[PDB]
């Protein structure tokens, strides 16, 4: 199974993606 390191890295990647969406929402 995915260990804590891989799972935490995926939550980091999720954060990058969600933050890019937050930025996109302000874009025009
Ligand atoms: Cl791992
Ligand atoms: Cl991304």
UniProtKB/Swiss-Prot annotation:
Upregulating conditions: Release is stimulated by hypoglycemia and inhibited by hyperglycemia, insulin, and somatostatin.
Disulfide bonds: none
List of residues that carry Phosphoserine: 1
Tissue specificity statement from the Swiss-Prot or TrEMBL entry: Secreted in the A cells of the islets of Langerhans.
Main function: Plays a key role in glucose metabolism and homeostasis. Regulates blood glucose by increasing gluconeogenesis and decreasing glycolysis. A counterregulatory hormone of insulin, raises plasma glucose levels in response to insulin-induced hypoglycemia. Plays an important role in initiating and maintaining hyperglycemic conditions in diabetes.
Record protein name field: Glucagon
Provenance organism: Homo sapiens
Organism taxonomic ancestry: Eukaryota, Metazoa, Chordata, Craniata, Vertebrata
Parent-record interval covered: 54 to 81 of 180
